[PDB]
Design a protein around this nucleic acid. Structure first.
Ligand code: CAC
Ligand code: CAC
Ligand code: MG
Ligand code: MG
Ligand code: MG
Ligand code: MG
Lengths: 168, 178, 168, 178
RNA sequence: UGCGACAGUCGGUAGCA
RNA sequence: UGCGACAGUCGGUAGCA
């Protein structure tokens, strides 16, 4: 049940990196983060991943548990980001603004450790949103750990932050 | 407001409807969502292509949902069907893809699709050039049409200067360049 | 007719580079070199190319006219060199020694600008062969130009060098 | 001379014969050439695998040349056929590939093939490990069997220390290492 | 040599180290 | 900033620049 809980958006290209072997795009990490929200009684969750991650794992962009991506798409949870090769090289469309544009227009929250310095500048109205709605995380081997104070000690609880109606 | 500053728009429906509904299902709903996006943007010239054999009742091997959405768009001079027929029990298809390209090319418009049409880029060089710079990709979020704000790489144009023929709408850039 | 002419071995991985856009593996170059020998009345010609060149053209190892390779294999002229990915990375088997080992055991000549510094050292008996049997080349846009004095002015003519029985 | 210092040898004939003759043709000649190479090297343990349906006369859709070479190698306890049969007009194949692997594994030998057996590496991890370090590839020059002198990368062993069980045969290396 | 550490070309992650 | 020129990881061609 979505008892007053918020839409959720995840920067998968950030999570998978920060989960295992930092240099590796470990899809498992995406799984662990998701399963956490699921077990937390969430319904609306969306992940973003540039599409060229389906491309077979090279040594220059290593990736593990690749089959997890298509499996999450099947549940209308994972969403790929437009990618293609123009003149033999790659065009990406910069997924970063997809994560925000979605969350902004849905009045949700972002799961990522990237501060989006570039986009805070591109649109002041976005800056405010990024300032108040970015949820960071820390990975410990095989457990999703978000902070109990997503903003500073001056900020709100974890439940009053991921819920639109606080329980006061 | 003026629509003459806008570019013609062509949509690969057989790509949209697939990518909207559980991939293996031809969900016409998406086509409606994609179009309405352009409409709200002040659009007049919009054209969709769909191989005609989709009017056939939803079979178990080629499932389709909300089938009646098609006739409503043809009635609006927006959807256009592509020739199909049965020769000796098989289907003739005429490959809708090149209808999408030929038109957008001949109208100097843009194509909406996630298919790169690699096969057609090779057959005609001038087409390749056009597809490279005039293909608009998208991403569907359940019931939300999301095109990229940078249809080409960061070095390329805005979504509006690419989706509009007069690109001179005031630009704002930073950085000292070479 | 093979009127006393020698077996021919070509370092394709060297030719294709040196033909067009030095940084590009231009298969056309292989074609031009071959066609030259063909028009010269040659029968035994063999080219070597590590197999991973069939892999689609990346920006990091660009290659053009890729379909020319399989087309030359069909004529029992092109030969691929064993390649595979062990642990996600590439193993190559170092084609260089295939070109020599073949030419040595066939008493032919090598077409390449590489001096094989490493192999002259690995086997002295090979060094002698490399010294006397390496034919260099120079590419001018779309024409195969070998030297009329494959060795120094002190050395032999082009025909007496690519033919085992000299015409004296 | 001693052959006990040698490793068991297994050959994927359906890969060799193909790659020798015009790819689409099953040229048994190659198998002979490949084997004789090992023989001249002082070999005793050599074993080949071939799906049995190759004894069927050369059909136009599955061409084969020098078919009689097969029986001669079976007669020599070198070639071994792999189970095949026709169920209801179709063929049952039993997938010769895993016969090659299981044996070489169980004999602690090496495999001669250009197929990486990716599918089998996944089914059994211990096999993957073995295939990575025990697959010997080759290259055919018309009528010449050429295996690499470095079956693994330059960092790996010689062709002989990989093709022999006792690797200690005097080594000569240069370079100061870490 | 010694094949790297580097010289050109180029990709993934970093917003200054 | 400014995204590069660079910092880590890494590939193709070079035998010393
Ligand atoms: C191994 As050295 C000191 O010649 O670069
Ligand atoms: C563009 As600058 C001088 O801040 O590196
Ligand atoms: Mg990013
Ligand atoms: Mg199509
Ligand atoms: Mg080389
Ligand atoms: Mg096989």
């Amino acid at each position: 049940n979505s008892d007053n809980l918020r839409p959720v958006v995840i920067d998968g290209s950030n999570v998978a990196m920060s989960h295992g072997n930092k240099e590796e795009f470990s899809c498992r990490g995406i799984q662990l983060a998701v399963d956490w929200f699921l077990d937390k009684g969430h319904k609306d969750i969306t992940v973003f991943v540039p599409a060229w991650r389906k491309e077979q794992s090279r040594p220059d962009a290593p990736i593990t548990d690749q089959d997890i991506l298509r499996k999450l798409e099947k549940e209308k949870i994972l969403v790929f980001t437009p990618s293609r090769r123009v003149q033999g090289r790659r065009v990406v469309c910069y997924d970063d603004r997809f994560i925000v544009k979605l969350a902004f227009d849905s009045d949700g929250i972002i799961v990522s450790n990237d501060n989006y310095r570039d986009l805070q500048v591109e649109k002041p109205e976005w800056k405010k949103f990024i300032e108040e709605r970015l949820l960071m995380y820390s990975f410990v081997n095989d457990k999703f750990m978000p902070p109990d104070d997503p903003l500073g000690r001056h900020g709100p609880s974890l439940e009053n932050f991921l819920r639109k109606r606080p329980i006061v």
